[PDB]
């Protein structure tokens, strides 16, 4: 995790990643999806 105020796209620069955890799922996993979050504010009625 790094703070950035850079490119909307990934900024040019070098950073390294470190291992957090190991989970033995053991699944033949073909695909993935990203879950996004919604935000409703004061202003918004929460309507979907």
């Amino acid at each position, epitope marked *: 995790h790094t703070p950035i*105020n*850079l*490119v*909307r*796209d990934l*900024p*040019q620069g070098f950073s390294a990643l470190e291992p957090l955890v190991d989970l033995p799922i053991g699944i033949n996993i073909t695909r993935f999806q990203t879950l996004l979050a919604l*935000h409703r*504010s004061y*202003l*918004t009625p929460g309507d979907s």
Partner: antibody
Amino acid sequence: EVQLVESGGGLVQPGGSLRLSCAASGFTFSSYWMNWVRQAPGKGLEWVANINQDGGEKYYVDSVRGRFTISRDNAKNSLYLQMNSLRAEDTAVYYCARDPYDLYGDYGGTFDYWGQGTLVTVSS
Amino acid sequence: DIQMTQSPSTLSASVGDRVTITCRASQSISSWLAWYQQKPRKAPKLLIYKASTLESGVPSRFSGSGSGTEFTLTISSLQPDDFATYYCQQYNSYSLTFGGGTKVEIKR
């Protein structure tokens, strides 16, 4: 005639607050991002703040962050910028301009329409 | 963030000549650059978007090109109307930034 008229400039002492407003016409106001850019005479043009079409997402330059809040009333067709803790440095001419969608990304068009400007002076 | 630096800061050219103002970003903006024209005390007008697309109603004399980090706005045949300060801006990433501004003046 796409138009943007700014109002609210004036003389303000340090620490004071003002709110400028920009009334828009000639386009579907609700559908576009609006920004406020300022030109401080000795210095150049600077981008102050931006608001998403929905009105929720709001971005600001670091200098202004606690001090300024940008908001809009679509029914009103008005955009506002409330300023606080004015400093001498904030003196500038503030222009409301209609921005492009950030989503366009690498193909960003930039600010298509601009208002005449409101002059705010911060001095004792 | 990214800093845009225009050059030259000021220039004087005769009418009809070709003027070329350059803008250099600190890092790759990609195509995300636009140009603005500003007259004294008047608000800026958008000349070019996406580095080379002419905004509606802008005179054809103005053109903009760019590749990599460096971009250029050329004015094929300078006219007296053209007197102004020209600014480049990069919408590529936040915060949005404008160049210092290049003042153009009619040489007589």
